[PDB]
Protein backbone atom coordinates (compact mmCIF):
# COMPACT_ATOMS: atom_id res chain seq x y z
CA UNK A 1 0.00 0.00 0.00
CA UNK A 2 0.84 3.68 -0.14
CA UNK A 3 1.37 3.62 3.59
CA UNK A 4 3.85 0.76 3.56
CA UNK A 5 5.84 2.44 0.77
CA UNK A 6 5.92 5.67 2.76
CA UNK A 7 6.98 3.86 5.96
CA UNK A 8 9.71 2.05 4.03
CA UNK A 9 10.94 5.37 2.66
CA UNK A 10 10.87 6.89 6.13
CA UNK A 11 12.92 3.97 7.39
CA UNK A 12 15.42 4.31 4.55
CA UNK A 13 15.79 8.02 5.24
CA UNK A 14 16.37 7.35 8.97
CA UNK A 15 19.22 4.86 8.75
CA UNK A 16 17.62 2.56 11.31
CA UNK A 17 15.08 -0.22 11.64
CA UNK A 18 11.43 0.76 12.07
CA UNK A 19 8.60 -1.42 13.32
CA UNK A 20 4.99 -0.29 13.18
CA UNK A 21 1.70 -1.89 14.03
CA UNK A 22 -1.63 -0.14 13.77
CA UNK A 23 -4.94 -1.66 14.81
CA UNK A 24 -8.03 0.23 13.71
CA UNK A 25 -10.74 -0.97 16.06
CA UNK A 26 -13.43 0.27 13.67
CA UNK A 27 -12.96 -2.80 11.43
CA UNK A 28 -10.13 -4.63 13.26
CA UNK A 29 -7.92 -3.90 10.27
CA UNK A 30 -4.18 -3.92 10.86
CA UNK A 31 -1.27 -2.13 9.23
CA UNK A 32 2.09 -3.72 9.90
CA UNK A 33 5.63 -2.77 9.01
CA UNK A 34 8.23 -5.27 10.27
CA UNK A 35 5.31 -6.35 12.41
CA UNK A 36 6.79 -9.72 13.37
CA UNK A 37 10.39 -8.64 13.97
CA UNK A 38 11.67 -8.37 17.50
CA UNK A 39 12.56 -4.98 18.89
CA UNK A 40 13.91 -4.00 22.31
CA UNK A 41 10.98 -2.77 24.35
CA UNK A 42 12.92 -0.55 26.75
CA UNK A 43 10.45 1.38 28.89
CA UNK A 44 7.41 0.33 26.88
CA UNK A 45 7.66 -2.81 29.01
CA UNK A 46 6.49 -0.73 31.98
CA UNK A 47 2.93 -0.98 30.70
CA UNK A 48 3.00 -4.75 31.18
CA UNK A 49 4.37 -4.49 34.71
CA UNK A 50 1.77 -1.92 35.72
CA UNK A 51 -0.99 -3.97 34.16
CA UNK A 52 0.17 -7.09 35.95
CA UNK A 53 -0.09 -5.31 39.28
CA UNK A 54 -3.53 -4.04 38.30
CA UNK A 55 -4.53 -7.63 37.58
CA UNK A 56 -3.39 -8.66 41.07
CA UNK A 57 -5.52 -5.88 42.54
CA UNK A 58 -8.68 -7.48 41.15
CA UNK A 59 -8.38 -10.03 43.96
CA UNK A 60 -6.30 -8.01 46.44
CA UNK A 61 -8.67 -5.08 46.48
CA UNK A 62 -6.42 -2.85 48.61
CA UNK A 63 -3.18 -3.73 46.83
CA UNK A 64 -2.67 -0.40 45.11
CA UNK A 65 -2.70 1.40 48.46
CA UNK A 66 0.06 -0.81 49.86
CA UNK A 67 3.06 1.32 50.86
CA UNK A 68 6.44 0.33 49.50
CA UNK A 69 9.62 1.73 51.03
CA UNK A 70 12.04 3.55 48.73
CA UNK A 71 15.58 3.08 50.02
CA UNK A 72 18.74 4.72 48.64
CA UNK A 73 19.94 1.33 47.41
CA UNK A 74 16.77 1.08 45.29
CA UNK A 75 17.64 4.07 43.14
CA UNK A 76 19.00 3.32 39.70
CA UNK A 77 19.84 5.55 36.76
CA UNK A 78 16.60 7.52 36.21
CA UNK A 79 14.21 7.99 39.13
CA UNK A 80 12.52 11.37 38.83
CA UNK A 81 9.66 10.46 41.18
CA UNK A 82 11.22 7.84 43.43
CA UNK A 83 14.03 10.30 44.20
CA UNK A 84 11.40 12.55 45.80
CA UNK A 85 10.41 9.79 48.23
CA UNK A 86 13.71 8.21 49.29
CA UNK A 87 13.51 7.04 52.92
CA UNK A 88 9.76 7.27 52.63
CA UNK A 89 7.10 5.16 50.98
CA UNK A 90 5.15 5.22 47.77
CA UNK A 91 2.02 3.18 47.23
CA UNK A 92 1.83 0.69 44.41
CA UNK A 93 -0.56 3.04 42.64
CA UNK A 94 1.97 5.87 42.97
CA UNK A 95 4.74 3.59 41.71
CA UNK A 96 2.61 2.48 38.77
CA UNK A 97 1.84 6.10 37.90
CA UNK A 98 5.51 7.03 38.19
CA UNK A 99 6.66 4.16 36.02
CA UNK A 100 4.11 5.00 33.35
CA UNK A 101 3.90 8.79 33.35
CA UNK A 102 7.51 9.67 34.14
CA UNK A 103 9.20 6.41 33.08
CA UNK A 104 10.69 6.09 36.54
CA UNK A 105 13.07 3.14 36.56
CA UNK A 106 13.08 2.59 40.32
CA UNK A 107 9.30 2.41 40.17
CA UNK A 108 9.52 -0.25 37.47
CA UNK A 109 11.89 -2.33 39.56
CA UNK A 110 9.50 -2.19 42.51
CA UNK A 111 6.68 -3.37 40.25
CA UNK A 112 8.86 -6.22 39.01
CA UNK A 113 9.66 -7.19 42.60
CA UNK A 114 5.96 -7.17 43.51
CA UNK A 115 5.39 -9.65 40.68
CA UNK A 116 8.18 -11.97 41.80
CA UNK A 117 10.75 -11.01 39.20
CA UNK A 118 10.79 -10.54 35.44
CA UNK A 119 9.29 -14.01 35.09
CA UNK A 120 6.20 -12.73 36.86
CA UNK A 121 5.77 -9.94 34.32
CA UNK A 122 6.24 -12.36 31.45
CA UNK A 123 3.77 -14.73 33.05
CA UNK A 124 1.10 -12.06 32.99
CA UNK A 125 1.71 -11.54 29.28
CA UNK A 126 1.28 -15.26 28.68
CA UNK A 127 -1.87 -15.30 30.79
CA UNK A 128 -3.52 -12.71 28.53
CA UNK A 129 -2.43 -14.52 25.37
CA UNK A 130 0.78 -12.70 24.47
CA UNK A 131 3.26 -15.45 23.63
CA UNK A 132 5.83 -13.00 22.26
CA UNK A 133 6.58 -10.56 25.06
CA UNK A 134 9.55 -11.48 27.18
CA UNK A 135 10.96 -9.57 30.10
CA UNK A 136 14.29 -10.98 31.20
CA UNK A 137 16.03 -8.25 33.15
CA UNK A 138 15.37 -5.38 35.51
CA UNK A 139 16.17 -1.71 35.15
CA UNK A 140 18.45 -0.41 33.84
CA UNK A 141 20.00 -3.38 32.03
CA UNK A 142 16.86 -4.26 30.11
CA UNK A 143 17.61 -1.24 27.89
CA UNK A 144 20.85 -2.51 26.38
CA UNK A 145 19.02 -3.09 23.08
CA UNK A 146 21.83 -5.19 21.63
CA UNK A 147 21.13 -6.16 18.00
CA UNK A 148 19.92 -9.72 17.77
CA UNK A 149 19.55 -10.19 21.51
CA UNK A 150 16.06 -11.61 22.17
CA UNK A 151 16.03 -10.52 25.81
CA UNK A 152 13.46 -7.89 26.74
CA UNK A 153 11.90 -7.79 23.30
CA UNK A 154 8.55 -8.08 21.67
CA UNK A 155 7.16 -7.55 18.21
CA UNK A 156 5.03 -4.64 17.05
CA UNK A 157 2.14 -6.93 16.20
CA UNK A 158 2.17 -8.59 19.60
CA UNK A 159 2.43 -5.37 21.54
CA UNK A 160 -0.36 -3.72 19.58
CA UNK A 161 -2.67 -6.66 20.24
CA UNK A 162 -1.75 -6.70 23.91
CA UNK A 163 -2.14 -2.96 24.35
CA UNK A 164 -5.57 -3.19 22.70
CA UNK A 165 -6.61 -5.94 25.11
CA UNK A 166 -5.39 -4.06 28.18
CA UNK A 167 -6.93 -0.67 27.36
CA UNK A 168 -9.89 -1.27 25.05
CA UNK A 169 -10.56 -4.93 25.76
CA UNK A 170 -11.26 -6.81 28.93
CA UNK A 171 -7.96 -8.37 29.96
CA UNK A 172 -8.37 -6.23 33.07
CA UNK A 173 -11.33 -5.54 35.28
CA UNK A 174 -13.35 -2.44 34.55
CA UNK A 175 -11.86 -0.32 37.35
CA UNK A 176 -8.35 -1.48 36.48
CA UNK A 177 -8.75 -0.82 32.77
CA UNK A 178 -10.02 2.66 33.47
CA UNK A 179 -7.09 3.30 35.78
CA UNK A 180 -4.59 2.17 33.17
CA UNK A 181 -6.20 4.40 30.54
CA UNK A 182 -6.13 7.35 32.90
CA UNK A 183 -2.45 6.74 33.60
CA UNK A 184 -1.56 6.47 29.92
CA UNK A 185 -3.50 9.60 28.99
CA UNK A 186 -1.49 11.45 31.65
CA UNK A 187 1.89 10.47 30.26
CA UNK A 188 4.38 13.33 30.38
CA UNK A 189 7.17 11.96 28.15
CA UNK A 190 5.40 11.58 24.81
CA UNK A 191 5.01 15.06 23.38
CA UNK A 192 7.69 14.63 20.69
CA UNK A 193 6.82 11.05 19.69
CA UNK A 194 3.53 9.65 18.30
CA UNK A 195 1.57 12.64 19.63
CA UNK A 196 3.61 15.05 17.51
CA UNK A 197 2.48 13.38 14.28
CA UNK A 198 -1.22 13.48 15.13
CA UNK A 199 -3.96 16.10 15.04
CA UNK A 200 -3.84 18.12 18.25
CA UNK A 201 -7.54 17.38 18.78
CA UNK A 202 -7.01 13.63 19.17
CA UNK A 203 -6.68 12.15 22.64
CA UNK A 204 -3.63 9.98 23.12
CA UNK A 205 -2.47 7.71 25.88
CA UNK A 206 1.05 6.44 25.36
CA UNK A 207 4.21 5.03 26.85
CA UNK A 208 7.59 5.92 25.42
CA UNK A 209 10.78 3.94 25.61
CA UNK A 210 14.40 4.69 24.91
CA UNK A 211 17.58 2.74 25.18
CA UNK A 212 20.97 2.10 23.75
CA UNK A 213 21.45 1.72 19.99
CA UNK A 214 19.36 4.89 19.68
CA UNK A 215 16.30 2.86 20.47
CA UNK A 216 13.28 5.13 20.39
CA UNK A 217 9.86 3.61 21.01
CA UNK A 218 6.31 4.66 21.70
CA UNK A 219 3.11 2.69 22.11
CA UNK A 220 -0.19 4.46 22.09
CA UNK A 221 -3.93 4.23 22.19
CA UNK A 222 -5.53 6.97 20.17
CA UNK A 223 -9.07 8.31 20.49
CA UNK A 224 -9.82 10.46 17.44
CA UNK A 225 -12.79 12.82 17.94
CA UNK A 226 -15.82 11.11 16.27
CA UNK A 227 -14.09 7.85 15.35
CA UNK A 228 -13.26 4.44 16.76
CA UNK A 229 -9.96 4.30 18.64
CA UNK A 230 -6.72 3.10 17.18
CA UNK A 231 -3.76 1.31 18.73
CA UNK A 232 -0.38 2.31 17.33
CA UNK A 233 3.01 0.84 18.22
CA UNK A 234 6.18 2.40 16.79
CA UNK A 235 9.56 0.86 17.54
CA UNK A 236 12.84 2.17 16.17
CA UNK A 237 16.42 1.11 16.68
CA UNK A 238 19.72 1.98 15.05
CA UNK A 239 22.97 0.24 14.21
CA UNK A 240 25.34 2.37 16.35
CA UNK A 241 25.45 1.67 20.08
CA UNK A 242 25.74 5.39 20.89
CA UNK A 243 23.18 6.63 18.35
CA UNK A 244 20.99 9.49 19.43
CA UNK A 245 17.27 9.16 19.97
CA UNK A 246 15.04 9.80 16.99
CA UNK A 247 11.61 10.68 18.33
CA UNK A 248 10.96 12.51 15.05
CA UNK A 249 10.86 9.18 13.28
CA UNK A 250 8.02 8.05 15.50
CA UNK A 251 6.18 11.32 14.92
CA UNK A 252 6.67 10.90 11.17
CA UNK A 253 5.44 7.33 11.22
CA UNK A 254 2.33 8.39 13.12
CA UNK A 255 1.72 11.17 10.61
CA UNK A 256 1.99 8.72 7.71
CA UNK A 257 -0.48 6.39 9.41
CA UNK A 258 -2.88 9.23 10.18
CA UNK A 259 -2.90 10.11 6.47
CA UNK A 260 -5.48 7.61 5.20
CA UNK A 261 -7.79 6.96 8.13
From TrEMBL:
Pfam families: Beta-lactamase2
Transmembrane portions of the chain: none
Keyword Isomerase attached: no
Reaction(s) this enzyme catalyzes, per UniProt: a beta-lactam + H2O = a substituted beta-amino acid
Chain segments annotated as coiled-coil in the UniProt record: none
EC top class, as a word: hydrolase
Keyword presence, Lipid metabolism: no
GO molecular function annotation: beta-lactamase activity
Record-listed E.C. numbers: 3.5.2.6
Annotated family: Belongs to the class-A beta-lactamase family.
Name of the protein this chain belongs to: Beta-lactamase
Taxon lineage: Bacteria, Pseudomonadati, Pseudomonadota, Gammaproteobacteria, Enterobacterales
Amino acid sequence: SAVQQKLAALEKSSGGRLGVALIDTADNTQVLYRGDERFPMCSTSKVMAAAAVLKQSETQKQLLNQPVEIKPADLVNYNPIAEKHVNGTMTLAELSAAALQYSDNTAMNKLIAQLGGPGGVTAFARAIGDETFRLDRTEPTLNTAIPGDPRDTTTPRAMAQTLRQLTLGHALGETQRAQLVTWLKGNTTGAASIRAGLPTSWTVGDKTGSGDYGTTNDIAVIWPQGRAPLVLVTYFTQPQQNAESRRDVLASAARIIAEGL
